Ligand binder design. Structure first.
Ligand SMILES: [Zn+2]
Lengths: 222, 61, 58, 159, 105
RNA sequence: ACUAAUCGAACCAUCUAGUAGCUGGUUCCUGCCGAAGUUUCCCUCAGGAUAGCAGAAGCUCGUAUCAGUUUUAUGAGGUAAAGCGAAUGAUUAGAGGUUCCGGGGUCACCUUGACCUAUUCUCAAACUUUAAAUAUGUAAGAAGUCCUUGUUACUUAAUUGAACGUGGACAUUUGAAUGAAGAGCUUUUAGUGGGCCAUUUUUGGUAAGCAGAACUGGCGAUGCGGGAUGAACC
RNA sequence: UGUCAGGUGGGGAGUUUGGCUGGGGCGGCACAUCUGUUAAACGAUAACGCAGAUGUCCUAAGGGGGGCUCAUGGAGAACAGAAAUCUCCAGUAGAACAAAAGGGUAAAAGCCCCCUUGAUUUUGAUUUUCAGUGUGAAUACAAACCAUGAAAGUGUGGCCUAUCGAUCCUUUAGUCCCUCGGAAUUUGAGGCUAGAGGUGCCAGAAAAGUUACCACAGGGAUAACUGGCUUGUGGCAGUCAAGCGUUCAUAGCGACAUUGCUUUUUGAUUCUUCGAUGUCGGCUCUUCCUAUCAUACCGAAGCAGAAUUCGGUAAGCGUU
RNA sequence: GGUUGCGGCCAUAUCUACCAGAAAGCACCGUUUCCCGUCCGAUCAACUGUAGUUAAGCUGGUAAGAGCCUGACCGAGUAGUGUAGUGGGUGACCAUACGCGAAACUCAGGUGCUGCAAUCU
């Protein structure tokens, strides 16, 4: 069947209806890959973190995320190469939209009842977003900043509503502000773990804290 | 335009005069209306409001 | 044909028109359902205390 | 269709609290209930025999009957334009003493106590409670406490 | 459903007043026994013209009968009735269960 | 088809003023009060009975056994929110670690097929630690408090206790606030039992002046000023 | 031939031919019940809302008591392999509890073992549905008698929330009881008290269709027309730009999305009309809109000319 | 102050590692005539407190311990929500006024407390 226009399912009209054992017969989401670019770079390689944040409360159709993801990748890749960035599609397609299946054939009024038992069958998936929630997060080196904003600008155009390109003060995908993460990385409380980093807590078994973070204890002692 | 907590123009709901036609039974009420009003004795007030009772409310003694 | 199934509109208006009123609790509630063992006492205890006050009244 | 069984819509009213499942603490059967006591109803779901209906959970009423293992509670009930009286067969596992009434009782002993000394000396001992009165005047000194000014903070994304 | 041929239950036989041994059977309705008051009335009403005059049952929904048990006190020969729940198939005291038994087919 | 302008059962008279849960109509004035479209049951859904809302007749008393109210105190809830480095269910990315219960490449031979652990992203009406707001139960005494000791076939080992008591002492306040327009009770009967809309919370639907719900208030039954005009809006 | 009986007997007679329902019919049961959600944190709350289930099953899968802990994972043990049985360790329950779901349960409400019938009698009170009616189900008791346990205690069926039925009539049991009225006896019948035979349309008629020959009462409480709400569907338009276009995204298109307009379709609805608004198409005739096919004047092209394509003002004028 | 028997609240008590335990007590421990029970005196039962013994168990302590329990002007007066507006916004929703007001997070603490009885260097 022809895909219904996104104008119909724009708003958060219905309560969440996710894939569960009560929601059995549903198709799969169009978006499957959520992390793109040089996704396995360490945290320091990509200091700057940019977010594409929705300013309104609507539903992002699952495939609209896939549609914007290919566009955001494609400008970014061809401008600064394959591995100059790492974009993460934060929000996920869990809300399963419903379609009431209809017959529009000649004289379909006979074979179909209209609104009797009009509970809709699953039509697709969409991502529920509220105001201020991040849609896209790209992390890259700071000189790449013009490219990622423009690349995010092209991705904004696949989304309904208004979205904002905000230059987050955090150090990449971390939860730490730039000047004070530098203090933390310098003091040596940070071990990479493939793509993200480990923090040393003031609480814990000191022997394990020593196992993971020998450099902190050496740095203080020295 | 005021709110009305209770029902307005609500009759007191009690018999004020014997709605029997009996003239003699109205003479007694005329006498006791004067006594109930012109005395402080609660007894006259009681008998005055017992003369108005209907036949079912004035059972034989 | 198709009539509205249920509507509690104006239901609380109606109840409060005559006022929602307590059952006007009285002293000495009914000994109804009270423990039959206890009740079969209270007959005798009252029977004893009445004659005791009667004898006291002489 | 539609169901209104004896215990419908009780997915969470008869759940035992977190880490409070299992055996009822043994003080429950030890509390003594006398006719006239004011008790509330909180049906611990663990004990299935003698549960109250889900309407009475939280309803506080007096005890009118005391039985081997149960007590009889009177609860007023909203039915149309009148309150009905509901006498309930309640296992003591589902009830506990009301702490509201004992607060009033201990106050009464406090009122009687201070009235007793008021009989000797100090008439007009002001029995009745007083709500929070408007605060009286006072002097606010500034020794070491100069009023430090504030300014509204500029908007920052903070993200 | 299986219930034993015997049961130790109460017997209000004016002499027992205590739990006594019982012999139990399936309830039998018994012969219709014409000359009953309804049958005499019904024969009078059916005789003549007008065809069927009283309703005749047609629509059947239940497929069970509440089995009633004809409790019979072994001593005083007093008969009492006990009812059970509905049952598609019912037996009287046969093939007593054994738990740790093999898979006999 | 035709059977006297009458025919899928003629015409005339009567039973007959047949029956109607259905349609139309139901005649003077003024005054006071004044709704309902909801519960439940019905071969019930165009209708009834029953409860409710209203009137009238009042009756018993005289400021209370009160209240669409608040405070204080003490309960109850599992919604909104929040949570997944918390359970179940999902979920993206990686990082580190295996019995001869699979190396698929030289026998124990690096050997890409695992799960487990420390993280990371996003969730949930039929998930949840926790958890509001509003709404909600009770109490705020004189039918109470305290002391003395009588009844019981009930209870205790007991002349212990439980209930009811008997006699004694309990105003500036008889034990929070505000108000009370009188308070409480009965009888009886009319009409109603087609509702609709607005804010907010909502369910199905793409949506609807759509269908169904919760709270409240309105229109119906209502004029008057405003929105040029309008049943609901101010 | 008369009477009675059995059959046959739409020839004929009478009558019925459920309800709900986004018109009705079909379907379905939303008609009696249950769980979770919807249900908006007391309660109550609907839809032909969603996920489902019930009309049974059990002398044990009831009751009491005793012993132990289950799912799983890991380590091991000839056959033995992932999975035959044994042993140990970790094991907050991730198992089981008859059956749908939910709640609840660790010296247990789970597995095994022993005994038992309380799944008994008399009734009454109370809770839910609620009119505070009945049925159903359930809670607490009392008088009894039993069961189990050493006892406390528990037990008036299933761990709890569903598993079910009025008057009449029949039949069975109990009281050996009352009556048969002019006395008596015995059968017989009728009573009283406890059930059963069933009414699932589940507060309970005994009930098959058609009407295009129809009629009546009505209904816009309800369709078929239009109109109105909305625009899914159809059409039309737009934004972005992966690419096609030899090279080049945008000459012309344009996938992936995404934003709108229209009532030129079909929808959904039941607001207006059922004491009638004459129901398609064609003939004819007028006007209007522009979302322009031609013509006027233009701009753009992968427009040399000509043919064309796109777009602008433009509905004046034509459109057989 | 320790121990035991019975406990109340039911992790501040739990869990995982290490250390310590005078006296008493607890337990481990020794043996199967009788009772009793099991494939198996391992469980249970009996009997000796005798052969020993802190290795356990148990109790206490230790851990920048997980957890759990408190607080915090840490988050946060945030999210949310009651009321109102001829408030903004096409809408989605948002701000405001009068109120109430979380949770996660972070920090700071703590790791049982008692009750009856007997007993103990
Ligand atoms: Zn007998």
């Amino acid at each position: 069947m022809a895909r219904r226009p996104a104008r119909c399912y724009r708003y958060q009209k219905n309560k969440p209806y996710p894939k569960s054992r009560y929601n059995r017969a549903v198709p799969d989401s169009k978006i499957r890959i959520y992390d793109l670019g040089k996704k396995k770079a360490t945290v320091d390689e990509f200091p700057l973190c940019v977010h594409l944040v929705s300013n309104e409360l609507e539903q992002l159709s699952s495939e609209a995320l896939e549609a914007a993801r290919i566009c955001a990748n494609k400008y970014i890749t061809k401008t600064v190469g394959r591995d100059a960035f790492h974009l993460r599609v934060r929000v996920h397609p869990f809300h399963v939209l419903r379609i009431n299946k209809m017959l529009s054939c000649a004289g379909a009024d006979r074979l179909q009842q209209g609104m009797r038992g009009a509970w809709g069958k699953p039509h697709g998936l969409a991502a529920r977003v509220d105001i201020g929630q991040i849609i896209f997060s790209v992390r890259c080196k700071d000189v790449n900043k013009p490219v990622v904003i423009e690349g995010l600008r092209r991705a904004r155009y696949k989304f309904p509503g208004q979205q904002k390109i905000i230059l987050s003060k955090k150090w990449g995908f971390t939860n730490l502000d730039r000047p004070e993460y530098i203090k933390k990385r310098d003091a040596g409380e940070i071990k990479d773990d493939g793509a993200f980093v480990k923090f040393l807590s003031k609480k814990g078994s000191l022997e394990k804290n020593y196992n993971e973070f020998p450099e902190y204890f050496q740095n203080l002692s020295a | 335009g005021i709110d009305h907590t209770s029902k307005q123009h609500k009759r007191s709901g009690h018999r004020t005069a014997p709605k029997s036609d009996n003239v003699y039974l109205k003479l007694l009420v005329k006498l006791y209306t004067f006594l109930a009003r012109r005395t402080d004795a609660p007894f006259n007030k009681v008998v005055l409001k017992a003369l108005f009772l209907s036949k079912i409310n004035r059972p034989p003694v | 044909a198709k009539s509205k199934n249920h509507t509690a509109h104006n239901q609380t208006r109606k109840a409060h028109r005559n006022g929602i009123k307590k059952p006007k609790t009285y002293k000495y509630p009914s000994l109804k359902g009270v423990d039959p063992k206890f009740r079969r006492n209270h007959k005798h205890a009252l029977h004893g205390t009445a004659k005791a006050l009667a004898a006291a009244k002489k | 269709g539609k169901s209104h069984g004896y215990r419908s819509r009780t997915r969470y009213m008869f759940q035992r609290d977190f880490r409070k499942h299992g055996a009822v603490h043994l003080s429950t059967y030890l509390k003594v209930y006398k006719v006239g006591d004011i008790v509330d109803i909180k049906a611990n779901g663990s004990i299935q025999k003698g549960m109250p209906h889900k309407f009475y959970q939280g309803k506080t009423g007096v005890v009118y009957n005391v039985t081997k293992s149960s007590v009889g509670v009177i609860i007023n009930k909203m039915v149309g334009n009148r309150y009905l009286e509901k006498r309930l067969n309640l296992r003591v596992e589902h009830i506990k003493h009301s702490k509201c009434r004992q607060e009033f009782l201990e106050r009464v002993k406090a009122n009687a106590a201070k009235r007793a000394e008021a009989k000797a000396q100090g008439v007009a001992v002001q029995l009745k409670r007083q709500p929070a009165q408007p605060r009286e005047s006072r002097i606010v000194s500034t020794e070491g406490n100069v009023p430090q000014t504030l300014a509204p903070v500029p908007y920052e994304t903070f993200i | 459903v299986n219930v034993p041929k015997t049961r130790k239950t109460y017997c209000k036989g004016k002499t027992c007043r205590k739990h006594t041994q019982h012999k139990v059977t399936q309830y039998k309705a018994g012969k219709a026994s014409l000359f009953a008051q309804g049958k005499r009335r019904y024969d009078r009403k059916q005789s003549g013209f007008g065809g069927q005059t009283k309703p005749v049952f047609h629509k059947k929904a239940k497929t069970t009968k509440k089995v009633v048990l004809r409790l019979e006190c072994v001593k005083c020969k007093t008969r009492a009735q006990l009812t059970l729940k509905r049952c598609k198939h019912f037996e009287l005291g046969g093939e007593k269960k054994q738990k740790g038994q093999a898979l006999q087919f």
